[PDB]
Symmetry: C3
Subunit: 161 residues, 3 copies
């Protein structure tokens, strides 16, 4: 396996219900893969889809961190202002140590692209030796957020181990 | 009534005691009114003044969100570093979901005007279908903070419904 | 004594164990001293070193705030992503009121220097009449963070009294 095991969680009632395909997940996998060396040897080893339900989100984040030994979890979607956007709230429950600088960089860089970046309520932090980062559900958002992180994310992953 | 009901809470021991007039409140109303179309049809339907007392602030934020069906609450003042500045602490108690990107944009844009922007401890978030945003008590601050939000605030209000 | 009493806490297992010298502490003292007038009359009156242990950090922050009447506490180190970096978590337990704008400015300015700024998880806030600010353990980091704060830090200290 890879130096760093990455898992991608798509959070979406629509995808989870089989009402539409996942358009964000593949973009996230592609960005991680294509940045594998810049990330210190990262590979996406697992994906999953959950609905916009705090308990479902918490359960997968806990399992992937505590049991499956993932190193990086990216979540996609559920960070906006609608009532069903609960990804940050689930995330804040599971993380042990907050990582606000990652949020800062994502926001700073995303705002250069679109003012609608301000509507992302993404959270991020560390549980055990797993880094968890919320990204927006727009496919273009993940690539932009990863580019913002890439200069330091390899070192984040080194440090958490 | 309007598409979006806005309420403005001035937080000030001085104004509340009748020791001075409200100079921030009218500026906040003026900025919202003059931006009504950019905001998707917003109108200020109510104002109030409370002292720098956490319970008084909490009570009005809860009433306006839970009973009076306000869509946007702007608070003015009580965000600084003095012992009596408790607006953020009251706000954090009543919000259900944090909206850090709004804080980011307000800070980012305010710092371009004055380094004293860093002394604002404003909070923001959603309770029910009510968006609550703390702004500084300086009259010039509200206009600057609203300009920072205006590119996306209409969509924030659409989403929370 | 000075108008403002400053205390500097170096947080480091290595320094605390006598395994290396403190290289950050002296730089922090030097930056405060050399900025004493810009800070409104600040002087570093005390330093200490603690290990990367939440209880040890909490205890000194509480003592310096509650008993020793310090006005500004700068902590150095323990803000990164390694398991032993627990300074922010200790800090969040002791502060009463968060001061996110200080964190914003430090991050914003630090990112101009190095992308590794995003790996700082520094916290900051007020306890009583004591302002507490976490800075990174890199000696160059303290100078850069203080320069970012200096335009408004005197007024922060005036306000907290
Ligand atoms: N980099 C980046 N960030 C972004 C976007 C984007 O296109 N690029 N879309 C925004 C929009 S349009 C919103 S509504 C929020 C929240 O999205 P979410 O609910 O899908 O997670 O993310 C914002 N963040
Ligand atoms: N945009 C903007 N933000 C601003 C200001 C301003 O003039 N414009 N004044 C600052 C000052 S001088 C302080 S002390 C804090 C806190 O103000 P408050 O306590 O009145 O809420 O807001 C800051 N934020
Ligand atoms: N201004 C500034 N901030 C900075 C740095 C710096 O050199 N200058 N170093 C960074 C690095 S390399 C990391 S790993 C984090 C955390 O450092 P800490 O664990 O020593 O506190 O701070 C970051 N913040
Ligand atoms: Cu959107
Ligand atoms: Cu001020
Ligand atoms: Cu580092």
């Amino acid at each position: 396996g890879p130096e760093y095991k990455v898992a991608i969680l798509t959070v979406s009632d629509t995808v989870s219900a089989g009402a539409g395909p996942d358009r964000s997940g593949p973009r996230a996998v592609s960005v991680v893969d294509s940045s594998s060396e810049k990330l210190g040897g990262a590979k996406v080893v697992a994906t999953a889809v959950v609905p916009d339900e705090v308990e479902r989100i918490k359960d997968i984040l806990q399992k992937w961190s505590d049991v499956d030994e993932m190193d990086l979890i990216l979540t996609l979607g559920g960070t906006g202002f609608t009532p069903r956007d609960v990804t940050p709230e689930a995330t804040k429950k599971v993380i042990e140590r907050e990582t606000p600088g990652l949020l800062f960089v994502m926001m700073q860089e995303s705002l250069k692209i679109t003012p609608f970046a301000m509507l992302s309520r993404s959270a991020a932090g560390i549980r055990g030796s797993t880094l968890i980062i919320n990204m927006p559900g727009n496919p273009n958002a993940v690539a932009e957020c990863m580019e913002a992180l890439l200069p330091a994310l390899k070192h984040a992953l080194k440090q958490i181990a």
